């Protein structure tokens with residue numbers, strides 16, 4: 008081991024656990040909820056207020072979540088979700104069929120439906136997404152071909168939340184990650200990434216997963232220095248509960264692939 012290996016994810020990552028610990032979106036102002044609320048506002052600002060639209064968006068390291076895709080789905084016609092953990096894909100798929108024993112995302116869904124103008128209702132927001140999500144593929148950011156042999160058109164947007172820091176055991180592995188992800192996008196295409204800053208781990212209940220503790224300095228470096236212009240970059244100091252993670256806040260950026 009050392010830094011959580013690929014198949015520690017295959018074997019110890021519990022989708023349902025994860026969701027409960029991070030995504031229950033309680034009415035009590037928990038660190039996990041403050042952070043979630045912010046990822047939300049940002050994703051709204053990016054996909055509904057800015058000029059981030061397109062035909063195709065690949066969401067990388069989706070894991071078992073969809074919150075990151077509630078706004079994007081008012082901007083893209085085709086949404087391909089991906090993850091390295093087959094059992095996370097299984098949990099997402101549960102939600103896409105809208106099965107009764109799927110995690111309940113409506114507090115979240117609700118939160119978004121306001122941000123956006125309360126124009127549409129939960130039910131209609133959820134349907135809209137289900138129809139966007141066209142495929143659910145296996146992926147690996149540490150491979151020059153993250154979706155393997157699967158044929159997809161050059162994407163307009165690659166997006167990733169709380170993934171690259173987790174999958175990348177070191178800096179070089181990260182920058183290659185970024186480069187490999189760049190191979191899925193057309194030039195002038197958008198890279199949206201949201202991760203934790205200076206995070207060395209995070210806990211899913213009892214089990215602990217590694218994490219490359221990156222500064223804003225190094226992240227910006229490895230992105231410019233990996234083929235992208237940065238449209239904006241935001242840092243929030245707000246962290247996860249100490250029991251949860253050792254992060255120092257979280258960044259999010261929007262980057263353009265050089266032509």
Ligand SMILES: Nc1ncnc2c1ncn2[C@@H]1O[C@H](CSCC[C@H](N)C(=O)O)[C@@H](O)[C@H]1O
Pocket residue numbers: 013016020067068069070071072075090091092095146147148149167168169170173174
């Ligand atoms: N090499 C790799 N390639 C792709 N995904 C990986 C990976 N290593 C770990 N992962 C995925 O990293 C994710 C980190 S948790 C984040 C899940 C989701 N993107 C969210 O915003 O909450 C998990 O889904 C795990 O399956």
Ligand SMILES: NC(=O)c1cccnc1
Pocket residue numbers: 169170172173202203206208209217218252
């Ligand atoms: N960046 C991380 O270490 C992280 C935090 C929360 C969930 N998943 C990954």
